[PDB]
Amino acid sequence: SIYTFNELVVLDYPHKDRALRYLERLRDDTGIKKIMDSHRWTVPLLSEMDPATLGLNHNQGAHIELRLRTDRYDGFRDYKTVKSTLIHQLTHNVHGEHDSSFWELFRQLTKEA
Ligand code: NI
């Protein structure tokens, strides 16, 4: 689809090859692809958030950041947690505040993904 992450950016820390594979896997994730296609979400930039809040959504999906690392050397967060954080950030494309409606949608997107 056009409803993907157009550009991936990782940071200059040890094992940056692994960081990039992390973002590529999230982008190629069947559940993530399905929900972005269904909801017509293009995210121009998916970037790694610096180590040392596990994600941010800037201006309704113009730029999403994900903290992949637990430290500055080789500690990475588990895919399961990062994936849920991405869905969290995507949920922010509709609901900015963590209110009743946010949790409904987040549960819905999680279900579909
Ligand atoms: Ni949030």
Author numbering: 2 to 53, 62 to 122
What does the paper say about this structure?
Covalent DNA-protein crosslinks (DPCs) are toxic DNA lesions that interfere with essential chromatin transactions, such as replication and transcription. In yeast, DPC proteolysis is catalyzed by the metalloprotease Wss1, which permits replication in the presence of DPCs and provides resistance toward DPC-inducing agents. Intriguingly, Wss1 is a DNA-dependent protease that degrades DNA-bound substrates in vitro irrespective of identity. Spartan (SPRTN, DVC1) is distantly related to yeast Wss1, displays a similar domain organization, and shares a common evolutionary origin (Stingele et al., 2015).
While most proteins were insoluble, we were able to purify the protease domain of Wss1b, one of the two SPRTN homologs in Schizosaccharomyces pombe. The overall architecture depicted a compact protease domain consisting of four tightly packed α helices and a four-stranded antiparallel β sheet. The glutamate residue E112 polarized a water molecule for the nucleophilic attack of the substrate; in agreement, its mutation to glutamine resulted in a catalytically inactive enzyme.
